[PDB]
Ligand binder design. Structure first.
Ligand SMILES: NC(=O)c1ccc[n+]([C@@H]2O[C@H](COP(=O)([O-])OP(=O)(O)OC[C@H]3O[C@@H](n4cnc5c(N)ncnc54)[C@H](OP(=O)(O)O)[C@@H]3O)[C@@H](O)[C@H]2O)c1
Ligand SMILES: NC(=O)c1ccc[n+]([C@@H]2O[C@H](COP(=O)([O-])OP(=O)(O)OC[C@H]3O[C@@H](n4cnc5c(N)ncnc54)[C@H](OP(=O)(O)O)[C@@H]3O)[C@@H](O)[C@H]2O)c1
Lengths: 319, 319
C-alpha cells in the first residue's frame, strides 16, 4: 500500500517512512517496533540522533519475531559532520552498522555539507557540535567530493546500498554531480509549505535525484527544542489555507501536509511519539490535490527555514 | 579619493572601477581611455563581454601617451563557462592576454560555477550560450576545484596576480575554500538594495574574501536587454527610500546606491556610457550614510535577482 520509489541506484525506497529524530532513547526501540507493526518499513535515522542502537533494537525485535526479514526493512543513516575526512568515513559507518546491528545500510547520506574537525568516537559520541576544543567550532579542509569518493568505495565494499546527500543547495548538488561516479540517489531537505524551494525540487527530480522531505510539518518538530523562530511561527495545522483544504476533502490538516509532498513524487518520513498517529501518517494517499489547491498552498512559501547551520555558527550553507 | 583594498593575495585593488559590460566595440577604446583620464584605474572586463581587444586599445593608448604605466592599471577578466576544463583554461587566459595586449591580468575570475562544453575560439568567439550543438546547452563534468587548480598554476606562472570567483553562493564558496591552496581573493556578485544577501557578504568578508558588487543599480543594466523581470521592476532611482535619502543629502540616487556598498567595504564597478555619470560614479565618497539610512535601505531586500542562470536553462546556481 505504501508506494515504492525506484532510486537511481536501482533499489526501491518506500515513499513513506518513519522519522527517528528526537525519539527518546527510553521509548525509541518500542516505538520503532510499533511502527513496523503499523506497516512502516523505511526508518530514517542518523548518527547525530544518538539513538541508532535503539532503532536497531526495534528492527531486530521485529526480525526475531518473524514479522519481517532484514531485506524488507530500508535503513537510512547519515554521516555526521565530524566524519568527512575519507580516513574517518568508514569508521563512522562501522559505528552505525554496529549500532543498527546490520551488515549494510540501505541508504547513507552526507548529513550536511559541513566538515567539523574530527573527534574520536571513543572521546564523545554522538559529538553534536563538539569539535575537540571546548565549545569552539573547528573545521577541516575536506572537500565534499573527497567524502563522496570514500562513500562510493563503501558502496563497492557492499556496506551501503545507495548513497545520497542531505541539506545540499542547488549549486553544490550540481558540482557534486560533475565529479560523482555513483550519482547521489537521494537529496533530503527541509520541505514544507513555508519553505517550498520549487526550483531546487524541479532541478533534482529532472536530474533523476529522488527527494526525501524532512520536517513536513514545518515548525512543529522544533517547538519542543525551544527554538524562537519555530515558536513565533503560526502552525501549519491551524493555518486557514491548510484547514480549508482539509475540510474540503474531509481530511486532516496533517494528511494534506503530507499528501502535498507525496503527490509530487516526494518521499516523506513523518516522525511521531504517538501510537495513534502511526497509521494516520502513512494512510494519507486517499485524495488528490487540484492545481488550485497547489496554487493556494504555494502562497505559503516564504522561505522560512527552521534547520539552518547559520544559526549554529554562521555557516553559509543556505546563503 | 578612491581607496585601495588590500586583497588576501597581498595586492591592492581600487575600490572603485569601470565596468566594461555592454560597452560597444566601436567606442570601447575611447570610453576606457576617457575613463583613465577621469581617474579610473581598475577595469572590470570579461571574455564574454567580447570587447577585451578594444578595452586593451584604450589602455594601450593611455600608456603610449604617458598618462599611466601598466603597473598603475588593474585589469580584471573572467573565464567564461566554455573554458572550465583545465586544459582549456590557459588557452582562454592567453586569448584574453593577447586581446588586452598585456603579459598578465591583475584579477581573473571564474565567471560562473557553470561548465559549458568547450567550443574552439576559431569556431565562435565569444561563444556566449553556444555549446557546439545548435541552440542546445551542453555541459562538461568538470568540478569547480579542478578549474580552480588550473588557475592556481597560472598565478604561479605569473600570468595572473590574484584569482577569484563570480556568482558563487555561500555553500559553494565554502567548499572551494576547503580545497583551495590560493584562497579566492574576490567574490564578485550581483549586489544592490533588492538583492542584499547580507549573510553572504558577512561570511565572505569574515573569511578574508573581498566583495565586488555588480549591477549596483539593480534592474537598470538589464533594461536595454529587454529582460521581462527588469522591465517590470520599479527602479531604485525612483524608490521613495532612495529618493528621500538622496534628497536629504543633495546627492543623486545613484551616488547613494554606490556609497551604500562602498561604505561597507564593497568594491564597485559602475558602468556608464555618459561622461557626467562617469565622473559622479567615481566621486561619490564624500558622505557617510547613517545607521538609520542603512536600516531604511535594508528594508528593500526582497531577494530580486536579475542575473540568474535559472533563466538560461534552469541551471540551479541560486536555488
Ligand atoms: N537531514 C536533516 O537534516 C534532518 C533534520 C530534521 C528532520 N530529519 C528527518 O525527518 C524526520 C521528520 O521531520 P521532523 O521530525 O523534524 O518533524 P515532522 O515529522 O515534521 O514533525 C512531526 C511533529 O508533529 C507531531 N506530529 C506527528 N504526526 C502528527 C500528526 N498526524 N498530527 C499532528 N502532529 C503530528 C509530532 O509530535 P509527536 O511525536 O508528539 O506525535 C512532532 O512534534 C525526522 O524525524 C528525521 O528522521 C532530517
Ligand atoms: N560577474 C558577473 O556576472 C557580472 C554581471 C553583470 C555586470 N558585471 C560587471 O559589473 C559592471 C557594472 O554592472 P552593470 O553594468 O551590469 O550594472 P550597473 O553598472 O548598475 O549599470 C548601470 C546602468 O545604469 C545607468 N547608469 C550608470 N551610471 C548612472 C548614474 N550615475 N545615474 C543613473 N544611471 C546610471 C547606465 O546607463 P548609461 O550607460 O546610459 O549611463 C547603465 O544602464 C559591468 O559593466 C560588468 O563589468 C559582472
Amino acid at each position: 500500500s505504501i508506494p515504492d520509489i525506484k532510486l537511481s541506484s536501482g533499489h526501491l525506497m518506500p515513499s513513506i517512512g518513519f522519522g527517528c529524530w528526537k525519539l527518546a532513547n527510553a521509548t525509541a526501540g518500542e516505538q520503532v517496533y510499533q511502527a513496523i507493526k503499523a506497516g512502516y518499513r523505511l526508518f530514517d535515522g542518523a548518527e547525530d540522533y544518538g539513538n541508532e542502537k535503539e532503532v536497531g533494537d526495534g528492527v531486530k525485535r521485529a526480525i526475531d519475531e518473524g514479522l519481517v526479514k532484514r531485506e524488507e526493512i530500508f535503513l537510512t543513516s547519515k554521516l555526521w559532520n565530524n566524519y568527512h575526512d575519507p580516513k574517518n568515513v568508514e569508521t563512522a559507518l562501522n559505528k552505525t552498522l554496529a549500532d543498527l546491528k546490520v551488515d549494510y545500510v540501505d541508504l547513507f547520506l552526507i548529513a550536511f555539507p559541513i566538515a567539523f574537525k574530527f573527534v574520536p568516537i571513543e572521546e564523545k559520541y554522538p559529538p553534536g557540535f563538539y569539535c575537540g576544543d571546548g565549545n569552539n567550532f573547528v573545521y577541516e579542509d575536506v572537500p565534499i567530493l573527497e567524502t563522496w569518493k570514500a562513500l562510493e568505495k563503501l558502496v563497492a565494499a557492499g556496506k551501503i546500498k545507495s548513497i545520497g546527500v542531505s541539506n545540499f543547495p542547488g549549486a553544490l548538488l550540481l558540482d557534486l554531480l560533475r565529479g560523482a561516479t555513483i550519482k547521489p540517489a537521494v537529496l533530503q531537505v527541509e520541505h514544507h509549505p513555508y519553505l517550498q524551494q520549487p526550483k531546487l525540487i524541479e532541478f533534482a527530480q529532472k536530474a533523476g535525484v529522488t527527494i526525501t522531505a524532512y520536517s513536513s510539518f514545518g515548525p512543529q518538530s522544533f517547538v519542543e527544542m525551544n527554538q524562537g523562530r519555530a515558536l513565533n511561527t503560526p502552525t501549519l495545522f491551524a493555518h486557514d489555507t491548510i484547514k480549508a483544504i482539509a475540510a474540503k476533502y474531509n481530511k486532516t490538516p496533517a494528511e494534506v501536509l503530507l499528501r502535498w509532498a507525496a503527490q509530487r513524487g516526494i518521499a516523506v518520513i513523518p516522525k511521531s511519539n504517538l501510537p495513534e498517529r502511526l497509521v494516520q501518517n502513512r494512510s494519507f494517499n486517499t485524495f488528490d490535490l487540484t492545481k488550485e489547491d497547489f496554487e493556494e498552498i504555494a502562497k505559503l512559501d516564504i522561505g522560512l527555514r527552521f534547520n539552518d547551520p547559520w544559526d549554529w555558527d554562521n555557516i553559509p550553507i543556505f546563503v
